[PDB]
Amino acid sequence: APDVQDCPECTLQENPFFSQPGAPILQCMGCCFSRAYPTPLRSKKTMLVQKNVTSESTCCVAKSYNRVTVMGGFKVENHTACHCSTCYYHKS
Numbered sequence: 001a002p003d004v005q006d007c008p009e010c011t012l013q014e015n016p017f018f019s020q021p022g023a024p025i026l027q028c029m030g031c032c033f034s035r036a037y038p039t040p041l042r043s044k045k046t047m048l049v050q051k052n053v054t055s056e057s058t059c060c061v062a063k064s065y066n067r068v069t070v071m072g073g074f075k076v077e078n079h080t081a082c083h084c085s086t087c088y089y090h091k092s
């Protein structure tokens, strides 16, 4: 029985606008699973519909973008290297 496509991994959602005959822009999808190494923590503003969107962790911010501002100024940081994790700094 068909339905959906589940939730792959945090990648790039190739710009469905800039996607021209030679330039397939992007904009990091966002679905790097929801692994829970230690005890799941919270408290960071968020406060969004708790519908399977609170457990997930890590964060992906195009490790290396190639931004191609489109439309009225659509930024896709033409993701050249999306990395889901390192959502902060240690030691420091």
Ligand SMILES: *[C@@H]1O[C@H](CO)[C@@H](O[C@@H]2O[C@H](CO)[C@@H](O[C@@H]3O[C@H](CO[C@H]4O[C@H](CO)[C@@H](O)[C@H](O)[C@@H]4O[C@@H]4O[C@H](CO)[C@@H](O[C@@H]5O[C@H](CO)[C@H](O)[C@H](O)[C@H]5O)[C@H](O)[C@H]4NC(C)=O)[C@@H](O)[C@H](O[C@H]4O[C@H](CO)[C@@H](O)[C@H](O)[C@@H]4O[C@@H]4O[C@H](CO)[C@@H](O[C@@H]5O[C@H](CO)[C@H](O)[C@H](O)[C@H]5O)[C@H](O)[C@H]4NC(C)=O)[C@@H]3O)[C@H](O)[C@H]2NC(C)=O)[C@H](O)[C@H]1NC(C)=O
Pocket (backbone or CB within 6 Å): 023, 024, 025, 026, 066, 068, 078, 079, 080, 081
């Ligand atoms: C927004 O951001 C996007 C990315 O997030 C960006 O798009 C991405 O751009 C990247 C480039 O900047 C691109 O990466 C490159 O991919 C090349 C391969 O592309 C093909 O495969 C991929 C993967 O499957 C596919 O997606 C892509 O469409 C290509 O598919 C082929 O396309 C053909 C038409 O173009 C098509 O037609 C023919 O088909 C034939 C039969 O199959 C055959 O394949 C023909 O070749 C082909 O033309 C073909 O069918 C199809 N094939 C398939 C599988 O479908 C890589 O080649 C390229 O690598 C090189 O560059 C990178 C970056 O610099 C280097 O890191 C890497 O090392 C390579 O560098 C050179 O490598 C050669 C290797 O030989 C070196 O040569 C040496 O030569 C010596 C002497 O002979 C000796 O032999 C040595 O051994 C050799 O090494 C050379 O020295 C190296 N140069 C240097 C300087 O070091 C690179 O990885 C990526 O794929 C894009 N991503 C996407 C989603 O498309 C987008 O552009 C951005 N947007 C904007 C607006 O900016």
